[PDB]
Amino acid sequence: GTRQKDLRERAERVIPGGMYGHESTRLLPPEFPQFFRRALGARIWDADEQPYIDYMCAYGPNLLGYRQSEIEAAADAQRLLGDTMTGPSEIMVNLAEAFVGMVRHADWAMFCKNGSDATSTAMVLARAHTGRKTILCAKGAYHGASPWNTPHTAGILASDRVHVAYYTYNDAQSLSDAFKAHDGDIAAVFATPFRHEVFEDQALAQLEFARTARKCCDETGALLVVDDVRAGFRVARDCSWTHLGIEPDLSCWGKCFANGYPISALLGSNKARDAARDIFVTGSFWFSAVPMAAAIETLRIIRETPYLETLIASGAALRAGLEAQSQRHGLELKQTGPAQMPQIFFADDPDFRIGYAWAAACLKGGVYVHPYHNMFLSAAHTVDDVTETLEATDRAFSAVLRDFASLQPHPILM
Amino acid sequence: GTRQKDLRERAERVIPGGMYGHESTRLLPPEFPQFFRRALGARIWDADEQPYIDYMCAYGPNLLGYRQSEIEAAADAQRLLGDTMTGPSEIMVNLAEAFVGMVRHADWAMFCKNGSDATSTAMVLARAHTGRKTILCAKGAYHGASPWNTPHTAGILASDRVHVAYYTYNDAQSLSDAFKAHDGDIAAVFATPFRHEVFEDQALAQLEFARTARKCCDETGALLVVDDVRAGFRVARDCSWTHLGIEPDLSCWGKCFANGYPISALLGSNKARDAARDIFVTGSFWFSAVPMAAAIETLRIIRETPYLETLIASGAALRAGLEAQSQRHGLELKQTGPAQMPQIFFADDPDFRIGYAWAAACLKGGVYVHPYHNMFLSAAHTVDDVTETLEATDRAFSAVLRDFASLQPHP
Numbered sequence: 001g002t003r004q005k006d007l008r009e010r011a012e013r014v015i016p017g018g019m020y021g022h023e024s025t026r027l028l029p030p031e032f033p034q035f036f037r038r039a040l041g042a043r044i045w046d047a048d049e050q051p052y053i054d055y056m057c058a059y060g061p062n063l064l065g066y067r068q069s070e071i072e073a074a075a076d077a078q079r080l081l082g083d084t085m086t087g088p089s090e091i092m093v094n095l096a097e098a099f100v101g102m103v104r105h106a107d108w109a110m111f112c113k114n115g116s117d118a119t120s121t122a123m124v125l126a127r128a129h130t131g132r133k134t135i136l137c138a139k140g141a142y143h144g145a146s147p148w149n150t151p152h153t154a155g156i157l158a159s160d161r162v163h164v165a166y167y168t169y170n171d172a173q174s175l176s177d178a179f180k181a182h183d184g185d186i187a188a189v190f191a192t193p194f195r196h197e198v199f200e201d202q203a204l205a206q207l208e209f210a211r212t213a214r215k216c217c218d219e220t221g222a223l224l225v226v227d228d229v230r231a232g233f234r235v236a237r238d239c240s241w242t243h244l245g246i247e248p249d250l251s252c253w254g255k256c257f258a259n260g261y262p263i264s265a266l267l268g269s270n271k272a273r274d275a276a277r278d279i280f281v282t283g284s285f286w287f288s289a290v291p292m293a294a295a296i297e298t299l300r301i302i303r304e305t306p307y308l309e310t311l312i313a314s315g316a317a318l319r320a321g322l323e324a325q326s327q328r329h330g331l332e333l334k335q336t337g338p339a340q341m342p343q344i345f346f347a348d349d350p351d352f353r354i355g356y357a358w359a360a361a362c363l364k365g366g367v368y369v370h371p372y373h374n375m376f377l378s379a380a381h382t383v384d385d386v387t388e389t390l391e392a393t394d395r396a397f398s399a400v401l402r403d404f405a406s407l408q409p410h411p412i413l414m
Numbered sequence: 415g416t417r418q419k420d421l422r423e424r425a426e427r428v429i430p431g432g433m434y435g436h437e438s439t440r441l442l443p444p445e446f447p448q449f450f451r452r453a454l455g456a457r458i459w460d461a462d463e464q465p466y467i468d469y470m471c472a473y474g475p476n477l478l479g480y481r482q483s484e485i486e487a488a489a490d491a492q493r494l495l496g497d498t499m500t501g502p503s504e505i506m507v508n509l510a511e512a513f514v515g516m517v518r519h520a521d522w523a524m525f526c527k528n529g530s531d532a533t534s535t536a537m538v539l540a541r542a543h544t545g546r547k548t549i550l551c552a553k554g555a556y557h558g559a560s561p562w563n564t565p566h567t568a569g570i571l572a573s574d575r576v577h578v579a580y581y582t583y584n585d586a587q588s589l590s591d592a593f594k595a596h597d598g599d600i601a602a603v604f605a606t607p608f609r610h611e612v613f614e615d616q617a618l619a620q621l622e623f624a625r626t627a628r629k630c631c632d633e634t635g636a637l638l639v640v641d642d643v644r645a646g647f648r649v650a651r652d653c654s655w656t657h658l659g660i661e662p663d664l665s666c667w668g669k670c671f672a673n674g675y676p677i678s679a680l681l682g683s684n685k686a687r688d689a690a691r692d693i694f695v696t697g698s699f700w701f702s703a704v705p706m707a708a709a710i711e712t713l714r715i716i717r718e719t720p721y722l723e724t725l726i727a728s729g730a731a732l733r734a735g736l737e738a739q740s741q742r743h744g745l746e747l748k749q750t751g752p753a754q755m756p757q758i759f760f761a762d763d764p765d766f767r768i769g770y771a772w773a774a775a776c777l778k779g780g781v782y783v784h785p786y787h788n789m790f791l792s793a794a795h796t797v798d799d800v801t802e803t804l805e806a807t808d809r810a811f812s813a814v815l816r817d818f819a820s821l822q823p824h825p
């Protein structure tokens with residue numbers, strides 16, 4: 001609309017490319033809005049005041065609803081006291097106690113801003129702890145956008161990641177072999193708790209893979225690092241490997257544990273405490289109290305309320321509804337990963353032209369779904385939201401069938 | 415006091431060493447409180463409700479006073495709309511226009527969280543722009559706590575910084591020599607706008623040094639990056655090298671441009687725009703609107719009010735007062751760098767025993783000063799605050815003289 005077009009014209013002049021990073025719409029159909037005006041519960045409004053039921057949950061942070069009144073009350077109370085001060089607030093202690101108490105593997109916490117801050121801290125910690133160099137990551141796994149791990153390597157030197165080595169996710173043989181390929185020199189294994197990457201089907205972690213990670217780390221003294229920045233608190237009320245009976249040495253957390261306030265965390269066992277004290281990591285904003293107050297109230301709600309069961313039920317209902325609509329319209333889906341963090345692709349759609357068209361058509365019905373990145377459910381998504389969503393998705397399936405002969409892949413994608 | 419001691423005991427159990435990073439009190443005298451309860455204007459209150467006139471300004475962020483009412487009203491207005499959303503707020507555009515408008519060398523802005531995010535982005539951008547490897551930094555200059563730049567190297571590999579090379583700050587010949595030592599391979603020169611580092615006297619940047627940096631960059635196509643995360647908006651209303659007449663290609667900003675709200679920025683000229691589009695930098699929280707709304711209002715106040723002149727006047731008064739006071743007591747100071755971001759050391763105090771004792775004695779008088787790290791003035795510090803500060807500093811000078819024979823360095 002008129003406001004979006006003005007904003008895009010202006011943005012291109014003063015922001016490289018008009019926008020950047022994971023929230024850029026550059027690889028989405030052109031009808032996706034870039035700039036928003038407001039948000040509440042499970043909904044966002046674009047600059048032209050069109051509402052969307054939001055299945056990105058702000059790319060993860062919106063766990064409980066935008067402007068959730070209890071979290072905003074806790075943030076308000078802390079803001080009357082102080083935020084970014086010469087030292088941390090006393091409540092930093094309360095937050096570390098609360099987080100450590102919830103995470104069975106952890107005896108301590110460190111707070112930072114970005115999830116990338118937490119994964120980088122984990123990497124440096126493991127090198128200090130072991131005196132070894134090699135960090136093992138799954139090929140194509142996203143752990144942040146630092147030089148060591150950013151997925152797109154313009155301006156990145158080989159030397160920035162020369163001591164990162166790779167294994168195939170969910171392949172126990174591949175991981176075992178990676179330990180032996182750098183025999184005696186493994187500082188850490190990083191693993192996301194499931195496979196959650198762009199343009200790729202999701203897949204749950206396999207027990208044998210997770211056991212092999214834990215066993216090889218135990219045998220060698222390497223630290224097991226679960227990167228829970230994305231899945232944290234939508235799989236479980238603890239580390240997302242809890243249900244596999246596999247406890248890491250370090251876990252990284254972010255996005256949603258203050259329901260949108262900027263704070264991330266490294267949780268660590270006592271095994272790793274000395275190395276955590278030896279490294280030097282910090283930032284201007286890492287000791288700010290208002291995000292910590294929001295985190296304390298979010299963690300309370302996580303502990304004390306059926307938020308998790310609620311958002312999973314909404315996810316499951318959406319999944320079932322799309323399966324049924326899929327069969328009716330003759331357009332097979334691949335719905336993968338947990339229903340509460342779903343990847344929803346079309347079968348037999350290798351250039352994504354079908355998925356792109358369908359996602360764009362859902363916008364016209366007031367639904368924001370994503371053709372290449374996993375989605376997310378919030379505890380604020382209602383049974384009514386899901387019913388209304390499925391009316392939009394029905395029409396989107398019809399629009400894709402109607403326009404099927406004229407569909408084109410995204411040019412920049414191509 | 416009692417609450418501080420309970421908190422340190424509890425902290426030790428659930429946080430490595432009870433605290434970490436630049437706000438840890440580990441290297442300060444033991445009477446420095448680690449944990450605080452509240453903050454307002456130029457004052458902080460510790461966990462035992464003792465007020466201090468605060469000369470750290472939260473280590474830079476507090477430019478206009480804690481809980482500054484206009485910035486909080488602007489933050490409130492945005493919070494009723496939305497903060498961390500599926501895309502940025504429309505106000506991201508307003509913020510970029512405002513920041514670009516204020517910064518003469520800049521045509522575009524990118525926003526992030528940490529100052530370290532901005533400096534890292536500048537590094538990657540320069541390598542993408544030039545296709546070269548070597549980043550030149552001043553020996554001992556702090557640009558963040560990433561693997562490539564962190565000052566303490568536990569867990570850091572040689573390979574993390576093998577393409578960072580060093581020059582001597584304020585030494586034009588050293589910088590020129592460093593270009594030639596990596597001939598045709600310089601991606602960027604990073605410089606803080608003055609020397610501002612721990613345990614060291616500060617020094618203003620020399621014109622010939624800055625001109626050399628600009629000229630060597632111009633000749634080689636390397637990018638000149640001014641790291642203004644610390645000094646930004648306390649030296650000038652533009653890049654802190656504005657008074658030298660030297661414009662960088664990139665400048666890095668953070669700490670105070672949203673008066674405590676967490677947001678940082680890379681500002682760049684069109685020369686660097688293509689490379690800025692080519693690199694991939696992002697974060698979950700980098701597109702949040704409320705820090706951007708605080709930033710817009712902070713930047714307006716910076717442009718439209720005499721905040722700079724106010725904090726400079728306060729810094730100048732404090733410096734002249736301490737000069738006179740120290741001389742009366744026969745204890746010479748080294749007050750270095752800008753008066754509004756002062757380093758206050760004692761002459762002939764190589765193990766900091768005197769400065770530590772003095773700084774500790776200031777706490778008893780309700781004044782928070784730092785014996786090894788530069789301090790900061792805010793526009794909320796008043797003439798009466800300086801007068802009251804000087805009463806406490808006087809007593810601290812007397813305390814140091816009384817206990818002089820017994821002073822011991824920090825363990």
Ligand SMILES: Cc1ncc(COP(=O)(O)O)c(CN)c1O
Pocket residue numbers: 282283284285527528529530531533556557558559606641642643644668669
């Ligand atoms: C000049 C300079 N540059 C970069 C940084 C990094 O900022 P942050 O701590 O917010 O990551 C700092 C922080 N002291 C700084 O002083």
Ligand SMILES: Cc1ncc(COP(=O)(O)O)c(CN)c1O
Pocket residue numbers: 113114115116117119142143144145192227228229230231254255696697698699
């Ligand atoms: C699993 C995972 N780890 C780390 C990060 C990095 O977090 P941030 O973008 O907040 O720096 C992300 C962000 N997508 C993530 O999904």
Ligand SMILES: [Mg+2]
Pocket residue numbers: 099100101102103104105106107
């Ligand atoms: Mg625990």
